[PDB]
């Protein structure tokens, strides 16, 4: 496609992705009640938790309120795979469990292996709610080699919170 387009002096820019990934970088214990409620609705509870969220106008206004606590951005397929394979897990209602063939078949009548799960999650938009709400929040370690500056500054200022765009993969890869 890129060849055909360049061969007729035109640029193509794909649609923005359907989901962002969010990581809780610093402690919320002194934030206001309005902030605490917003973190609850995104299922974030302890430091170094990571979670996936629908890209949508409501979500983008929720993120604006909490941007001083969280790093966020977009995630390509290679990193999504390493996350699910190395740190993924699930729940039925109050029972926490490992992702196995029996448990997929039970929950989603037509997904049978962990590779089909990752494929649907990335490529099918209309099933995102069901597919996302099956996974538990990911529990990560602090990054290997530490943070370079005062993490509470914005990424533009040289810290660690805010919008890392196409480059969140680098933070997550040090935290798996």
């Amino acid at each position: 496609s890129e060849e055909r387009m360049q061969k007729e002096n035109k640029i193509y820019a794909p649609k923005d992705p359907h989901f962002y990934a969010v990581v809780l970088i610093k402690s919320p214990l002194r934030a206001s009640n309005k902030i605490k409620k917003t973190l609850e609705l995104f299922r974030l509870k302890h430091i170094n938790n990571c979670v996936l969220v629908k890209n949508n106008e409501s979500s983008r206004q929720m993120l604006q309120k909490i941007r001083n606590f969280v790093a966020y951005g977009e995630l390509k397929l290679k990193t999504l795979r390493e996350l699910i394979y190395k740190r993924g897990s699930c729940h039925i209602f109050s029972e926490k469990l490992n992702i196995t063939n029996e448990t997929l078949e039970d929950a989603f009548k037509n997904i049978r292996c962990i590779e089909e799960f990752i494929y649907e999650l990335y490529f099918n938009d209309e099933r995102f709610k069901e597919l996302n709400n099956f996974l538990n929040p990911f529990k990560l370690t602090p990054p290997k080699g530490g943070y370079k500056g005062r993490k509470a500054k914005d990424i533009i200022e040289g810290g660690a919170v805010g919008n890392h765009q196409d480059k969140i993969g680098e933070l997550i890869k040090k935290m798996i």
Binding site: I11, A13, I155, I156, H164, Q165, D166, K167
Partner: protein, 170 residues
């Protein structure tokens, strides 16, 4: 270290490609995110398109060759913010790349005027021949007329204590 990037972008509303114009901007920055930040800054001040109505279509890095590390002369036009106002000026440097030239200016102004790197703006970078040089500083080095000896001593070994009768420096 500093790098050079060129960012391209368009306007959008409730529907796509609302203007047929494309806008471009060359910038020296450390990474792509600091590049994209600058593009947003200039659009909002020279036009009035805020981020929610913009989309970046491309970011590209610009790189030279210089396999033999040949040394060249450059002139740079800049401004910076102080406590009073904004101060414009021009200075000349030598180096193996445009980025090598630009990193030396940023270091200079931080040393001489006590300014953080984000308050300095580059307006123009130009490569020059020997007849073009304006100020005094680099001309002797450009005309190839310099030799000098070493002022700093250098340690011979990593050991902390050594015998009195050994050679200590260089």
């Amino acid at each position: 270290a500093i790098n050079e990037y060129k960012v391209y972008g368009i306007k959008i509303d409730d529907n796509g490609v609302v203007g047929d114009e494309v806008y471009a901007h060359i910038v020296f920055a450390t990474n792509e995110l600091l590049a994209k930040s600058s593009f947003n800054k200039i659009l909002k001040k020279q036009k009035k398109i805020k981020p929610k109505n913009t989309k970046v279509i491309k970011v590209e890095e610009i790189k030279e060759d210089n396999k033999d590390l040949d040394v060249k002369n450059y002139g740079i036009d800049y401004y910076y913010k102080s406590k009073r106002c904004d101060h414009k000026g021009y200075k000349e440097f030598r180096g193996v790349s445009r980025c090598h030239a630009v990193d030396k200016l940023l270091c200079d102004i931080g040393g001489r005027h006590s300014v953080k790197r984000n308050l300095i703006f580059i307006m123009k970078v130009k490569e020059l021949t020997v007849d073009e040089i304006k100020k005094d500083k680099i001309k002797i080095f450009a005309m190839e007329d310099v030799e000098y000896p070493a002022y700093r001593n250098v340690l011979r070994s990593n050991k902390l204590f050594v015998s009195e009768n050994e050679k200590l420096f260089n």
